[PDB]
A paper describes a structure:
The V3 loop of the [name]-1 envelope (Env) protein elicits a vigorous, but largely non-neutralizing antibody response directed to the V3-crown, whereas rare broadly neutralizing antibodies (bnAbs) target the V3-base. Challenging this view, we present V3-crown directed broadly neutralizing Designed Ankyrin Repeat Proteins (bnDs) matching the breadth of V3-base bnAbs. While most bnAbs target prefusion Env, V3-crown bnDs bind open Env conformations triggered by CD4 engagement. BnDs achieve breadth by focusing on highly conserved residues that are accessible in two distinct V3 conformations, one of which resembles CCR5-bound V3.
In order to define V3-crown epitopes that lead to broad neutralization, we co-crystallized bnDs with V3-IF ([name]), i.e., the V3-crown mimetic that all bnDs bound best. Considering this similarity, the conformation of V3 bound to bnD.2 will hereinafter be referred to as Post-CCR5-V3. Noteworthy, we observed that the Post-CCR5-V3 conformation is occasionally sampled spontaneously, possibly promoting the interaction with either CCR5 or bnD.2. Despite this observation, the different V3-crown mimetics, as well as linear V3-crown peptide, were able to adopt the Post-CCR5-V3 conformation when in complex with 63_B7 and bnD.2. It should be noted that 63_B7 and bnD.2 were selected using different panning targets (V3-IY mimetic and CD4-bound gp120, respectively), thus highlighting again that a common transient conformation of the V3 must exist. Despite different preferences for the Inter- or Post-CCR5-V3 conformation, the bnDs overlapped in their contact patterns, engaging mainly with R/H308, I309, P313, F317, and Y318. The R308 side chain engages via a salt bridge with bnD.1 and bnD.2. The bnDs make extensive contacts with Y318 and F317 which are exposed to opposite sides of the V3 loop in the Inter- and Post-CCR5-V3 conformations, due to the presence or absence of the helical turn. This enables bnD.2 to approach the V3-crown from the opposite side compared to bnD.1 and bnD.3, and to interact with several shared conserved contact residues on the V3-crown. MAb 10A37 targets a conformation closely related to Post-CCR5-V3 bound by bnD.245,46.
Residue numbers in the entry:
A (entry chain D): 1 to 15
B (entry chain C): 13 to 138
């Protein structure tokens, strides 16, 4: 959850 | 759904399962039905170098994009996997690729404090 990736965090996170 | 199983095996770092699924009919360029991400996207994000290498060997598109415009290089640069960044670049990853907000892999390395990756990307953009 700490990684600044944008809206795509919904699919990838994870961290 | 062999494609979805391959996506999940890449996400989970299951090297043997990735190789077996592809030999058994899974498409190396499978994509998620809702967001377009590929196994290589997931391996680059999750940090599985050996899976990245086997997907590339088998024919994964190094410059595939998902629904947010992210490439595997964006994802590896954001999380901070230096070795994966270098492998992707060696295989032709587009250092200038912009996501849906105009952000490059370099921008994501900066945002996440991955200075060694940022320097690699800045120099590759020369
Ligand atoms: Cl998945
Ligand atoms: Cl770094
Ligand atoms: Mg491993
Ligand atoms: Mg740092």
């Amino acid at each position: 959850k700490s990684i600044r990736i944008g809206p795509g965090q919904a699919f990838y996170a994870x961290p | 759904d062999l494609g979805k199983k391959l996506l999940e095996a890449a996400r989970a770092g299951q090297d043997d399962e990735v190789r077996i699924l592809m030999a058994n009919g899974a498409d190396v360029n499978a994509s998620d039905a809702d967001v377009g991400a590929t196994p290589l996207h997931l391996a680059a994000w999750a940090g599985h170098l050996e899976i990245v290498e086997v997907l590339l060997k088998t024919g994964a598109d190094v410059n595939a994009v998902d629904i947010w415009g992210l490439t595997p290089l964006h994802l590896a640069a954001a999380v901070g996997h230096l070795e994966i960044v270098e492998v992707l670049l060696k295989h032709g990853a587009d250092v200038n690729a912009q996501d849906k907000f105009g952000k490059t892999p370099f921008d994501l390395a900066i945002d996440n404090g991955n200075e060694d990756i940022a320097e690699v990307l800045q120099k590759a953009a020369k």
